[PDB]
Design a binder for this molecule. Structure first.
Ligand SMILES: Cc1cc2nc3c(=O)[nH]c(=O)nc-3n(C[C@H](O)[C@H](O)[C@H](O)COP(=O)(O)O)c2cc1C
Ligand code: SF4
Ligand code: FES
Ligand SMILES: [Cl-]
Ligand SMILES: [Cl-]
Ligand SMILES: [Cl-]
Ligand SMILES: [Cl-]
Ligand code: NA
Lengths: 156, 416
């Protein structure tokens, strides 16, 4: 019943043809699925397993293991907030407070329109520019609420 | 057009790995070629794989990923086994405070690519991989584009520069697990499986990817390979102290005036890194502690140590996180405990339960909700994460926290 749109299926086949073995493309495929839907739809796992020539249980275990993948909440933009040591030291709590003031949500929550989800994450590798956050693939240093508000207004 | 990347400050006294990466922008193949780029590859292809291994061995280059294994020796172990062989560039990074690898990837990708080609030729690998953490999407797109540029210039594909040497570099992405930086879990992830570390021996150099001889090297280790070929092993050995030679990248963060990456010789002291290079502390406050990533904790009395691989040296990956006099050590220890709780793969029972309990009990201590039993339990679990552990994570999950208990007892005591 569930079938990937041709535009996405083409992208998935491209990843499957990229590595010497089909099964090596599993994570690139799941990144592609999440980038398209704004989450991993549970129903997408069976046709993906078929394309990768892997059992469904294998694919389910992989999705559960790699925590960048979200099977529960659909969100257009994932605000990944570093909660590790350097960012904590430099102002994670100020960034989280500014996010709540602007968006009305706390970590783990999604805005009512399904536009933004705050995702607490471990060290993003930009510690010198702490406190760090990402908005999908874009990464930034949080400076203040006014600066953060201008950044978020670019995601429509 | 690539996704937004923060503009990490970078400075060098050696002008080697940061010759271009000191500028916060992508340096494409034409700019790399203008600096004499890919000429070390051409020289390498006129040498035998065995001579390249000899040069890399004689240079004294040691792994930059944390274990510090001599690179030339690792390659020597791999080629003692029959082919096909695989070469893997470990770009998982992800340790708290560590951001040295991404600046090579995102600003000077051809330096890494050239090093991967030379290394693959040295070990007879015709298939190479870059495994980059999923949270570096710009690095991924930059590498895919740079690999295409290298292919079009004839530095990749079949019969490279008429040498008969074939090579394809595939870029794989991680998807959230710190454990995927551990070389065996990285290999499992490349096979399309969960990043679960495997028991060693067998070591990857004997049985790695698809059970074949596999060399895994860190981004920074590989970035040195074009310099050893270009300068020759003897001239490379002249850089820094003769016992820990070559350039080293130091990611400095926390309470410093100029946080960023510093390319320095390994005879530089920790005090010089902070005060001479990183501009001293924020507000000129006293250094309280230096966290060597999530691995070690050094007190203000240990700043005159060298930034090398010596037993009394800084060690680790040269990751410098500075805490000053007002930073609460218990709150800082909690963040380290939370990191290990989140990243244990859970295969080993004392690691699985110990990383979880260490963080859960430390949170109770921090919030003032800990009973006398919770304090004793916390002390016990911190000393018991390592038993039966398959990989390095279980062996170090309690290390930094134990050093804070030994070096800052008065601060811990005010929570009791
Ligand atoms: C839990 C754990 C995580 C690791 N993460 C990394 C990492 O992100 N990057 C890295 O190059 N090495 C990492 N290592 C070390 C690798 O297993 C391996 O020693 C290294 O990639 C070999 O390259 P090198 O000899 O050039 O240092 C990690 C080790 C452990 C135990
Ligand atoms: S020591 Fe910890 S991280 Fe390593 S394999 Fe065992 S459970 Fe996983
Ligand atoms: S601690 Fe937040 S990016 Fe490293
Ligand atoms: Cl099935
Ligand atoms: Cl020559
Ligand atoms: Cl290791
Ligand atoms: Cl005991
Ligand atoms: Na990863």
């Amino acid at each position: 019943e569930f079938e990937f749109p041709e535009e996405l299926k083409t992208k998935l086949q491209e990843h499957i043809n990229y590595f010497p073995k089909k099964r090596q493309a599993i994570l690139l495929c799941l990144h592609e699925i999440q980038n398209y839907y704004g989450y991993i739809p549970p129903e997408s796992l069976k046709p993906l397993a078929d394309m990768l020539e892997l059992p469904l249980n294998h694919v389910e275990g992989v999705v559960a293991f790699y925590d960048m993948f979200d099977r529960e909440d659909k969100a257009k933009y994932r605000i990944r907030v570093c909660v590790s040591i350097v960012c904590h030291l430099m102002g994670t709590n100020k960034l989280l407070k500014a996010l709540e003031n602007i968006l009305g949500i706390k970590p783990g929550e999604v805005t009512p329109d399904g536009k933004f989800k705050i995702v607490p994450v471990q060290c993003l590798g930009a510690c010198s520019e702490a406190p760090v956050f990402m908005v999908n693939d874009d990464e930034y240093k949080f400076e203040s609420e006014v600066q953060l508000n201008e950044i978020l207004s670019r995601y429509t | 057009s690539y996704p937004a990347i923060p503009r990490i400050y970078a400075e060098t006294t050696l002008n080697m790995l940061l010759k271009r990466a000191k500028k916060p922008r992508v340096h494409s193949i034409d700019e790399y070629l203008k600096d004499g780029g890919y000429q070390a590859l051409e020289k390498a292809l006129n040498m035998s794989p065995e001579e390249i291994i000899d040069w890399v061995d004689k240079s004294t280059l040691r792994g930059r990923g944390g274990a510090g294994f001599p690179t030339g020796k690792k390659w020597k172990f791999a080629v003692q086994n029959p082919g096909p062989r695989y070469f893997i560039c470990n770009a998982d990074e992800s340790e708290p405070g560590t951001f040295k690898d991404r600046i090579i990837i995102e600003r000077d990708p051809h330096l890494l690519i050239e090093g991967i080609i030379i290394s693959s030729y040295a070990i007879g690998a015709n298939e190479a991989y870059i495994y980059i953490r999923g949270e570096y999407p710009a690095g991924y797109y930059i590498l895919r584009d740079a690999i295409e540029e290298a292919k079009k210039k004839g530095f990749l594909g079949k019969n490279i520069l008429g040498s008969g040497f074939d090579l394809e570099i595939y870029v794989a992405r991680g998807a959230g697990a710190y454990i995927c930086g551990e070389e065996t879990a990285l290999i499992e992830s490349l096979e399309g499986k969960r990043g679960h570390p495997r028991l060693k021996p067998p070591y990857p150099v004997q049985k790695g990817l698809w059970g074949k001889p596999t060399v895994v090297n860190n981004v920074e280790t590989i970035a040195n390979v074009p310099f050893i070929i270009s300068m020759g092993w003897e001239e490379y050995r002249y850089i820094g102290p003769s016992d820990y030679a070559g350039p080293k990248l130091f990611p400095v963060s926390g309470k410093v005036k100029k946080p960023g990456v510093y390319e320095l010789p390994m005879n530089t002291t920790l005090r010089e890194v902070i005060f001479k290079y990183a501009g001293g502390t924020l507000g000129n406050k006293k250094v309280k502690a230096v966290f060597s990533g999530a691995l070690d904790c050094f007190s203000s009395e240990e700043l005159d140590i060298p930034m090398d691989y010596s037993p009394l040296g800084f060690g680790g990956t040269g990751t410098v996180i500075v805490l000053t006099e007002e930073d609460d050590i218990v709150e800082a220890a909690l963040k380290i405990a939370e990191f290990y709780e989140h990243e244990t793969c859970g295969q080993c029972t004392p690691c699985r339960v110990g990383c979880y309990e260490q963080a859960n009990l430390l949170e109770k201590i921090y919030k003032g909700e800990a009973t006398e039993q919770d304090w004793e339990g916390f002390d016990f679990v911190n000393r018991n994460i390592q038993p039966t552990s398959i990989c390095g994570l279980g062996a170090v999950a309690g290390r930094l926290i134990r050093q804070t208990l030994e070096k800052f007892p008065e601060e811990w005591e005010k929570y009791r």
